[PDB]
From TrEMBL, chains A, D:
Residues 1-108 form the Thioredoxin domain. One of its GO terms (cellular component) is cytosol. It comes from Escherichia coli (strain UTI89 / UPEC). GO terms for biological process: cell redox homeostasis. Belongs to the thioredoxin family. It comes from the Bacteria. This is Thioredoxin. GO terms for molecular function: protein-disulfide reductase activity. Keywords: Disulfide bond, Electron transport, Oxidoreductase, Redox-active center, Transport.
Length: 108, 229, 229, 108
């Protein structure tokens, strides 16, 4: 289901906050159906947006401490990062088109 | 004091929900285990546990089965379930040691396809006739053959929809319909699965959001909740 | 001698079809009018006539209504019926002078669309939840509110499918299910419509093979029979 | 529903048996759903096969005497005529493609 740069509370500091470039983080959980629902879309986006965007996924199940840090109200929430600093945030399950638009508009 | 249904069925649908409302108001404060326990002896004869064996059957099955060993678990086999679903059943029935009651149609898959054909292609009325002969009728026959007056189901207020019109207790077909894990949410179920070493349905971890039947039958508000704030 | 259902429900599904088989064997020789008449007083309290008001409702309605004036005609209004269907109902209820009993959902079309949404797009389970809250539950509530023990329906062995497992008489939900025009065929219905000056559903003469609901819900073995030879 | 050269027992002799050309007859009835089901298809075929084929419909309801004459077992049955003489016969509701093939093959 999920096959990308998987994150943890430990790696958050280096792999995201100290990452050189743009990173899209997907705060998900094993129980949220609409979260697993967007997994294939994120994989496809990771393929096409290669080089430009770094796609990542964080599982709140074993990594809870980071969701409150960005005021996550209810997974699936997407956090776009640009050089460690957070740009935009999308809440809920989205379509490939809506995801592309969400990314493109902020990426620039 | 033990509830009388032969008098409850002699009451309209609203007096029923109102009279039962006073009892449900109490069941609302208890946990899933307390509701099953309360139901065990406050309600009458034959208690059955009907399951669909989907993404979260392991919860209700394990919970209710631990409470009551070798309880009549009703499985209405439509005939076209996912292969991994059957193995999930045969895996559970052996792991949880369940008194499995299988109830399929009066006719088989090939029989139905020759007699009527691919009902699912024949629109809603065809799907209705399909659901009636594959799920409804078999269940109605199961309740009677097992002589049940109480029936437990692992329904949640979350899955598709069962807002405050679906009380923990109820009367569907002259039988006390009980739903213990009703107020439970995806977190609570996931946690229950973890705490008891129970696994999710083999397909859930692939893409199938809600498995059921295969033949063009199977293929979630945009969000879930960590709790709004 | 008058049949006891409180004892019939205390019998399995097969002993039921076998015990009732001896009675049905007799109902099989009588005509639609004789079956309704036989049912009038051999069966117990409150006789209802549930109709869908489709392509051939005019038959069963007129027949049963003539036999029994101002009989409780149950119409479970889903909320999204064809406009011409409503006018067909309001046209009949006035022409045939029927004691119409309308039973819609607990919530309205807009309510359901805001609470759940377009259930018909949400697959089979969504359609099931739709049919349960729009047709099933409302009907189950109708039978109770009207206190019926006998229920007449204009079903045929021909429409979608009701082979020799659908007896003229039956017990669905603790109620004597009667189907008078069961052995009737399209010719017999068409002839009945002609002989009594009754008209077909306004849409049947346009293209709609089997009208019901609109919202992506509505849109026949290759043959009919002059009798094989 | 039905809009074409409608036949009767009276007109059968002249309009079909004494017609100069190819005529496709559709023995139908008001009650046979699959019969009314092919009505739009026959209309479309009548439009495209104009000049070559004459499309017709006979209603057994008021015109029963002609069905037995061609051994009709159960409407919808299509009878293809070529200069008064019957060529082929198709039984049951058919698709536009199957109807075209049925016609073309015999028409020639």
């Amino acid at each position: 289901s999920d096959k990308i740069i998987h994150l943890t509370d430990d790696s958050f500091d280096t792999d995201v906050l100290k990452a050189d470039g743009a990173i899209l983080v997907d705060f998900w959980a094993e129980w949220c159906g609409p979260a697993k629902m967007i997994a294939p879309i994120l994989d496809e986006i990771a393929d096409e947006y290669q080089g430009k965007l770094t796609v990542a996924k964080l599982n709140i199940d074993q990594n809870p401490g980071t969701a409150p840090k960005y005021g996550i109200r209810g997974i699936p929430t997407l956090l776009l990062f640009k050089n460690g600093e957070v740009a935009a945030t999308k809440v809920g399950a989205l379509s490939k088109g809506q995801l592309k638009e969400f990314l493109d508009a902020n990426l620039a | 004091s033990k509830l009388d249904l032969n008098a409850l069925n002699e009451l309209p649908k609203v007096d029923r929900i109102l009279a039962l409302a006073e009892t449900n108001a109490e069941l609302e404060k208890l946990d899933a285990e307390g509701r099953v326990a309360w139901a065990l002896d406050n309600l009458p004869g034959e208690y059955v546990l009907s399951s669909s064996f989907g993404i979260q059957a392991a919860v209700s099955l394990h919970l209710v089965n631990q409470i009551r060993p070798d309880i009549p678990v009703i499985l209405t086999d439509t005939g076209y379930l996912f292969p991994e679903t059957y193995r999930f059943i045969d895996e559970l029935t052996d792991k949880l040691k369940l008194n499995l009651k299988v109830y399929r149609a009066t006719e088989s898959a090939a029989w139905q396809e020759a007699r009527y054909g691919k009902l699912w292609e024949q629109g809603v009325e065809g799907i209705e006739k399909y659901n009636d002969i594959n799920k409804v009728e078999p269940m109605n026959r199961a309740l009677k053959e097992l002589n049940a007056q109480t029936w437990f189901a692992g329904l949640r207020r979350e899955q598709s929809g069962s807002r405050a019109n679906l009380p923990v207790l109820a009367i569907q077909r002259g039988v006390f319909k009980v739903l213990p894990i009703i107020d439970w949410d995806n977190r609570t179920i996931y946690q229950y699965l973890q705490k008891h070493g129970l696994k999710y349905h083999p397909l859930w971890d692939e893409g199938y959001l809600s498995v059921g039947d295969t033949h063009t039958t199977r293929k979630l508000k945009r969000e879930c909740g960590l709790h709004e704030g």
